[PDB]
Every structure is written in structure tokens, then in C-alpha cells.
Amino acid sequence: PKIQTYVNNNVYEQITDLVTIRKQEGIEEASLSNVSSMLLELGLRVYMIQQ
Amino acid sequence: PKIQTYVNNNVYEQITDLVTIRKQEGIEEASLSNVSSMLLELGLRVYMIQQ
Numbered sequence: 001p002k003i004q005t006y007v008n009n010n011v012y013e014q015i016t017d018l019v020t021i022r023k024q025e026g027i028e029e030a031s032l033s034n035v036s037s038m039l040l041e042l043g044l045r046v047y048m049i050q051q
Numbered sequence: 052p053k054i055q056t057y058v059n060n061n062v063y064e065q066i067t068d069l070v071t072i073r074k075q076e077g078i079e080e081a082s083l084s085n086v087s088s089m090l091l092e093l094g095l096r097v098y099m100i101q102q
Binding site for chain 1: 052053054055056057058060062063065066069072083084085087088089090091092093094095097098099102
């Protein structure tokens with residue numbers, strides 16, 4: 001399903017910076033949406049480890 | 052700004068489970084949106100560490 005969330009401008013920029021980096025690393029299809037989805041899942045995994 | 056992304060049903064459920072847990076831990080205002088935003092920032096931090 002869709003998730004709609006809100007971040008500060010600095011965090012937003014850091015995610016868009018990662019889109020550029022991901023493309024440079026050969027992920028031609030990288031987008032704000034699919035980078036965000038990957039980061040959200042990574043954060044979920046780490047937060048569950050730290051519980 | 053707003054971020055709109057998409058996750059599988061299992062990941063979505065795990066995030067909603069964390070909303071329930073966060074409320075149980077005293078975060079009365081926890082929501083899918085604000086849990087997601089916190090996880091997205093955590094994932095960003097970990098991914099940048101692992102670069």
C-alpha cells in the first residue's frame with residue numbers, strides 16, 4: 001500500500017542526494033519513491049533490532 | 052515536504068504494529084505517518100553509515 005509521510009527540508013534533500021548517488025552506482029531506475037521505500041524498510045529493521 | 056512511497060503488505064503491517072507498540076510505550080500521538088517519518092530518517096542514517 002501507499003504511505004504518505006512528511007520530513008524536514010534537510011532530510012528530504014539528503015534522500016534526493018541518495019537518488020543521485022544510487023543512479024551513479026548503476027541504479028538507473030532510482031527515484032525518491034523507491035529510495036524512500038528502501039530506507040523505510042531498513043529503518044523498520046534497525047528499529048525492531050533496537051527494541 | 053511530503054514523501055509518498057509504496058511498500059508490500061507485510062512491511063505495511065509491521066509499521067502499523069509499531070504504531071500500536073509506540074502507543075503502548077506512551078507515545079499517545081503515534082501515527083502511521085509519524086512512525087514512518089521516524090523510520091525513514093533512521094534508515095537514511097544507517098544507509099549513509101554503510102556507504
